[PDB]
Coordinates of all heavy atoms in Angstrom, one line a residue:
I1386 N 0.8 -1.2 0.0 CA 0.0 0.0 0.0 C 0.9 1.3 0.0 O 0.5 2.3 -0.6 CB -1.0 0.0 1.2 CG1 -2.0 -1.1 0.9 CG2 -1.6 1.3 1.5 CD1 -2.8 -1.5 2.1
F1387 N 2.1 1.2 0.6 CA 2.9 2.4 0.8 C 4.2 2.3 -0.1 O 5.1 3.1 0.1 CB 3.3 2.5 2.3 CG 2.1 2.5 3.2 CD1 1.8 1.4 3.9 CD2 1.3 3.6 3.2 CE1 0.7 1.4 4.8 CE2 0.1 3.6 4.0 CZ -0.1 2.5 4.8
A1388 N 4.1 1.4 -1.1 CA 5.3 1.2 -1.9 C 5.6 2.3 -2.9 O 6.8 2.6 -3.2 CB 5.1 -0.1 -2.7
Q1389 N 4.6 3.0 -3.4 CA 4.7 4.0 -4.4 C 4.0 5.3 -4.0 O 3.1 5.3 -3.2 CB 4.2 3.5 -5.7 CG 4.9 2.3 -6.3 CD 6.3 2.6 -6.7 OE1 6.6 3.7 -7.2 NE2 7.2 1.6 -6.7
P1390 N 4.4 6.5 -4.7 CA 3.7 7.7 -4.4 C 2.2 7.6 -4.7 O 1.9 6.8 -5.7 CB 4.3 8.7 -5.3 CG 5.6 8.1 -5.7 CD 5.5 6.6 -5.6
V1391 N 1.3 8.2 -4.0 CA -0.1 8.3 -4.4 C -0.2 9.0 -5.7 O 0.5 10.0 -6.0 CB -0.9 9.1 -3.3 CG1 -2.3 9.3 -3.8 CG2 -0.9 8.3 -2.0
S1392 N -0.9 8.4 -6.7 CA -1.0 8.9 -8.0 C -1.9 10.1 -8.1 O -3.1 10.1 -7.7 CB -1.5 7.8 -9.0 OG -1.9 8.4 -10.2
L1393 N -1.4 11.2 -8.7 CA -2.2 12.4 -8.8 C -3.2 12.3 -10.0 O -4.1 13.1 -10.1 CB -1.3 13.6 -8.9 CG -0.4 13.8 -7.7 CD1 0.6 15.0 -7.9 CD2 -1.3 14.1 -6.5
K1394 N -3.0 11.3 -10.8 CA -3.9 11.0 -11.9 C -5.2 10.4 -11.3 O -6.3 10.6 -11.6 CB -3.3 10.1 -13.0 CG -2.5 10.9 -14.0
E1395 N -4.9 9.5 -10.3 CA -6.0 8.7 -9.7 C -6.6 9.3 -8.5 O -7.7 9.1 -8.1 CB -5.4 7.3 -9.3 CG -4.9 6.6 -10.6 CD -4.1 5.3 -10.2 OE1 -3.9 5.0 -9.1 OE2 -3.8 4.5 -11.2
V1396 N -5.8 10.2 -7.8 CA -6.3 11.0 -6.7 C -6.0 12.5 -7.0 O -5.0 13.0 -6.4 CB -5.7 10.6 -5.4 CG1 -6.4 11.3 -4.2 CG2 -5.9 9.1 -5.2
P1397 N -6.7 13.2 -7.9 CA -6.3 14.5 -8.3 C -6.3 15.6 -7.2 O -5.5 16.5 -7.4 CB -7.3 14.8 -9.4 CG -8.4 13.9 -9.3 CD -7.9 12.7 -8.6
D1398 N -7.0 15.4 -6.2 CA -7.1 16.4 -5.1 C -6.1 16.1 -4.0 O -6.1 16.9 -3.0 CB -8.5 16.5 -4.5 CG -8.9 15.4 -3.6 OD1 -8.2 14.3 -3.5 OD2 -10.0 15.5 -2.9
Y1399 N -5.2 15.2 -4.1 CA -4.4 14.7 -3.0 C -3.6 15.8 -2.4 O -3.5 15.9 -1.1 CB -3.5 13.6 -3.4 CG -2.8 12.8 -2.2 CD1 -3.6 12.1 -1.3 CD2 -1.5 12.9 -2.1 CE1 -3.0 11.5 -0.3 CE2 -0.8 12.2 -1.0 CZ -1.6 11.5 -0.1 OH -1.0 10.8 0.9
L1400 N -3.0 16.7 -3.2 CA -2.1 17.7 -2.6 C -2.9 18.8 -1.9 O -2.3 19.6 -1.2 CB -1.2 18.3 -3.7 CG -0.3 17.3 -4.4 CD1 0.7 18.1 -5.3 CD2 0.5 16.5 -3.4
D1401 N -4.2 18.9 -2.1 CA -5.0 19.8 -1.3 C -5.1 19.3 0.1 O -5.4 20.1 1.0 CB -6.5 20.0 -1.9 CG -6.5 20.6 -3.3 OD1 -5.6 21.3 -3.7 OD2 -7.5 20.4 -4.0
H1402 N -5.0 18.0 0.3 CA -5.1 17.4 1.6 C -3.7 17.2 2.3 O -3.6 17.6 3.5 CB -5.7 16.1 1.5 CG -7.2 16.1 1.1 ND1 -8.2 16.1 1.9 CD2 -7.7 16.3 -0.2 CE1 -9.4 16.2 1.3 NE2 -9.1 16.3 0.0
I1403 N -2.8 16.7 1.5 CA -1.5 16.3 2.1 C -0.4 17.1 1.5 O -0.1 17.1 0.3 CB -1.3 14.8 1.7 CG1 -2.3 13.9 2.4 CG2 0.1 14.3 2.1 CD1 -2.4 14.1 3.9
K1404 N 0.3 17.9 2.4 CA 1.2 18.8 1.9 C 2.6 18.3 1.6 O 3.4 18.8 0.9 CB 1.3 20.0 2.9 CG 0.0 20.8 3.0 CD -0.4 21.3 1.6 CE -1.8 21.8 1.6 NZ -2.2 22.4 0.2
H1405 N 3.0 17.1 2.3 CA 4.2 16.5 2.1 C 4.1 15.0 1.9 O 4.2 14.2 2.8 CB 5.2 16.8 3.3 CG 5.4 18.2 3.5 ND1 4.8 19.0 4.4 CD2 6.2 19.1 2.8 CE1 5.2 20.2 4.4 NE2 6.1 20.3 3.4
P1406 N 3.7 14.6 0.6 CA 3.6 13.2 0.3 C 4.8 12.4 0.6 O 5.9 12.9 0.4 CB 3.2 13.2 -1.2 CG 2.7 14.5 -1.4 CD 3.5 15.5 -0.5
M1407 N 4.7 11.1 1.0 CA 5.8 10.3 1.1 C 5.5 8.8 0.9 O 4.3 8.4 1.0 CB 6.5 10.4 2.5 CG 7.9 9.8 2.7 SD 9.1 10.1 1.4 CE 9.1 11.9 1.4
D1408 N 6.4 8.0 0.5 CA 6.2 6.6 0.2 C 7.6 5.9 0.2 O 8.6 6.5 0.2 CB 5.6 6.4 -1.2 CG 6.5 6.9 -2.3 OD1 6.5 8.1 -2.5 OD2 7.3 6.1 -2.8
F1409 N 7.6 4.5 0.2 CA 8.8 3.8 0.3 C 9.8 4.0 -0.9 O 11.0 4.0 -0.7 CB 8.6 2.3 0.5 CG 8.2 1.9 1.9 CD1 7.0 1.2 2.1 CD2 8.9 2.3 3.0 CE1 6.6 0.8 3.3 CE2 8.5 1.9 4.3 CZ 7.3 1.2 4.5
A1410 N 9.2 4.1 -2.1 CA 10.1 4.3 -3.3 C 10.8 5.6 -3.2 O 12.0 5.7 -3.5 CB 9.2 4.2 -4.6
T1411 N 10.1 6.7 -2.7 CA 10.7 8.0 -2.6 C 11.8 8.0 -1.5 O 12.9 8.6 -1.7 CB 9.7 9.0 -2.3 OG1 8.7 9.0 -3.4 CG2 10.3 10.4 -2.2
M1412 N 11.6 7.2 -0.4 CA 12.6 7.1 0.6 C 13.8 6.4 0.1 O 14.9 6.7 0.4 CB 12.0 6.4 1.9 CG 11.0 7.2 2.7 SD 10.6 6.3 4.2 CE 12.1 6.4 5.1
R1413 N 13.6 5.4 -0.7 CA 14.7 4.6 -1.2 C 15.6 5.4 -2.1 O 16.8 5.3 -2.1 CB 14.2 3.3 -1.9 CG 15.2 2.2 -2.1 CD 14.6 0.9 -2.6 NE 13.7 0.3 -1.6 CZ 14.1 -0.5 -0.6 NH1 15.4 -0.7 -0.4 NH2 13.3 -1.0 0.3
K1414 N 14.9 6.3 -2.9 CA 15.7 7.2 -3.8 C 16.6 8.1 -3.0 O 17.7 8.3 -3.3 CB 14.7 8.0 -4.7
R1415 N 16.0 8.7 -2.0 CA 16.8 9.6 -1.1 C 17.9 8.8 -0.4 O 19.0 9.3 -0.3 CB 15.9 10.3 -0.1 CG 16.6 11.2 0.8 CD 15.7 12.1 1.6 NE 16.4 12.9 2.6 CZ 15.8 13.6 3.6 NH1 14.5 13.8 3.6 NH2 16.5 14.2 4.5
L1416 N 17.6 7.6 0.1 CA 18.6 6.8 0.7 C 19.8 6.5 -0.2 O 21.0 6.6 0.3 CB 18.0 5.5 1.2 CG 18.9 4.5 1.9 CD1 19.4 5.0 3.2 CD2 18.2 3.2 2.1
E1417 N 19.6 6.1 -1.4 CA 20.6 5.7 -2.3 C 21.5 6.9 -2.7 O 22.6 6.7 -3.2 CB 20.1 4.9 -3.5 CG 19.5 3.6 -3.1 CD 20.5 2.7 -2.3 OE1 21.7 2.7 -2.6 OE2 20.0 2.0 -1.4
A1418 N 21.0 8.1 -2.6 CA 21.7 9.3 -2.8 C 22.4 9.7 -1.5 O 22.9 10.9 -1.4 CB 20.9 10.4 -3.3
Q1419 N 22.4 8.9 -0.5 CA 23.0 9.2 0.8 C 22.4 10.5 1.4 O 23.1 11.3 1.9 CB 24.5 9.2 0.8 CG 25.1 7.9 0.4 CD 26.6 7.9 0.6 OE1 27.3 8.9 0.8 NE2 27.1 6.7 0.6
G1420 N 21.1 10.6 1.2 CA 20.4 11.9 1.5 C 19.8 11.9 3.0 O 19.3 12.9 3.3
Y1421 N 20.0 10.9 3.8 CA 19.7 10.9 5.2 C 20.9 11.1 6.0 O 21.7 10.2 6.1 CB 18.9 9.7 5.6 CG 17.5 9.6 4.9 CD1 17.3 8.5 4.0 CD2 16.5 10.4 5.2 CE1 16.0 8.4 3.4 CE2 15.2 10.3 4.6 CZ 15.0 9.3 3.7 OH 13.8 9.2 3.1
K1422 N 21.1 12.2 6.7 CA 22.3 12.5 7.4 C 22.3 11.9 8.8 O 23.3 11.7 9.4 CB 22.5 14.0 7.6
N1423 N 21.1 11.5 9.3 CA 20.9 10.9 10.6 C 19.6 10.1 10.6 O 18.8 10.2 9.7 CB 21.0 12.0 11.7 CG 19.9 13.1 11.5 OD1 18.7 12.8 11.3 ND2 20.4 14.3 11.5
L1424 N 19.4 9.3 11.7 CA 18.2 8.5 11.8 C 17.0 9.3 12.0 O 15.9 9.0 11.5 CB 18.4 7.5 13.0 CG 17.2 6.6 13.3 CD1 16.9 5.7 12.2 CD2 17.4 5.8 14.6
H1425 N 17.1 10.5 12.6 CA 15.9 11.4 12.8 C 15.3 11.7 11.5 O 14.0 11.7 11.3 CB 16.3 12.6 13.6 CG 15.1 13.5 13.8 ND1 14.2 13.3 14.8 CD2 14.7 14.7 13.2 CE1 13.2 14.2 14.8 NE2 13.5 15.1 13.9
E1426 N 16.1 12.1 10.5 CA 15.6 12.5 9.2 C 14.8 11.3 8.5 O 13.8 11.5 7.8 CB 16.7 13.0 8.3 CG 17.4 14.2 8.8 CD 18.4 14.8 7.8 OE1 18.8 14.1 6.8 OE2 18.7 16.0 7.9
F1427 N 15.4 10.1 8.6 CA 14.8 8.9 8.1 C 13.4 8.6 8.8 O 12.4 8.4 8.1 CB 15.8 7.8 8.3 CG 15.3 6.4 7.8 CD1 15.6 5.9 6.6 CD2 14.5 5.6 8.6 CE1 15.2 4.7 6.1 CE2 14.1 4.4 8.2 CZ 14.4 3.9 6.9
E1428 N 13.4 8.7 10.1 CA 12.2 8.5 10.8 C 11.1 9.6 10.5 O 9.9 9.2 10.5 CB 12.4 8.6 12.3 CG 13.1 7.3 12.9 CD 13.0 7.2 14.4 OE1 11.9 7.4 14.9 OE2 14.0 7.0 15.1
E1429 N 11.5 10.8 10.2 CA 10.6 11.8 9.8 C 9.8 11.4 8.6 O 8.6 11.5 8.5 CB 11.3 13.1 9.5 CG 11.8 13.9 10.7 CD 12.2 15.3 10.4 OE1 12.4 15.6 9.2 OE2 12.3 16.1 11.3
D1430 N 10.5 10.9 7.6 CA 9.9 10.5 6.3 C 9.0 9.2 6.6 O 7.9 9.1 6.0 CB 10.9 10.2 5.3 CG 11.3 11.4 4.5 OD1 10.7 12.5 4.7 OD2 12.2 11.3 3.6
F1431 N 9.5 8.3 7.4 CA 8.6 7.1 7.7 C 7.3 7.6 8.3 O 6.2 7.1 8.0 CB 9.4 6.1 8.5 CG 8.6 4.9 8.9 CD1 8.1 4.0 8.0 CD2 8.3 4.7 10.3 CE1 7.4 2.9 8.4 CE2 7.5 3.6 10.7 CZ 7.1 2.7 9.7
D1432 N 7.4 8.5 9.3 CA 6.2 8.9 10.0 C 5.3 9.7 9.0 O 4.1 9.6 9.2 CB 6.6 9.8 11.2 CG 7.2 9.1 12.3 OD1 6.8 7.9 12.5 OD2 8.0 9.6 13.1

């Protein structure tokens, strides 16, 4: 359920509700760019 970003084609109003979308694919992209400097930043995205 949380593997991919919510699709704006399938949920066109999503950004009116949710200001900072997140999903596991997006976290993995940031991770492989070494974009988490500490565990807190990683936990923020999971939350």
